[PDB]
Amino acid sequence: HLEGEVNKIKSALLSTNKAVVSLSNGVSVLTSKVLDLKNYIDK
């Protein structure tokens, strides 16, 4: 019961962590495109 709730919070936090990782992967892709774009400007 209370053990159950704790277990649920653990599952919910693992899902939040996965949200943060995938947002990070979004920012890394976008960063690459921004640098591809300065190169495009320079050249």
Binding site: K8, I9, A12, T16, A19, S22, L23, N25, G26, K33
Partner: protein, 34 residues
């Protein structure tokens, strides 16, 4: 316009942000079962 290059970047990025939002929805949903 260059629809092909915009499409590919937008879809890579959009699919990460949409995936992040679904994990959040999952986390909220589980938290509403407490």
């Amino acid at each position: 316009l260059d629809p092909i290059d915009i499409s590919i970047v937008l879809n890579k990025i959009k699919s990460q942000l949409e995936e992040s939002k679904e994990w959040i929805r999952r986390s909220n949903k589980i938290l509403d079962s407490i």
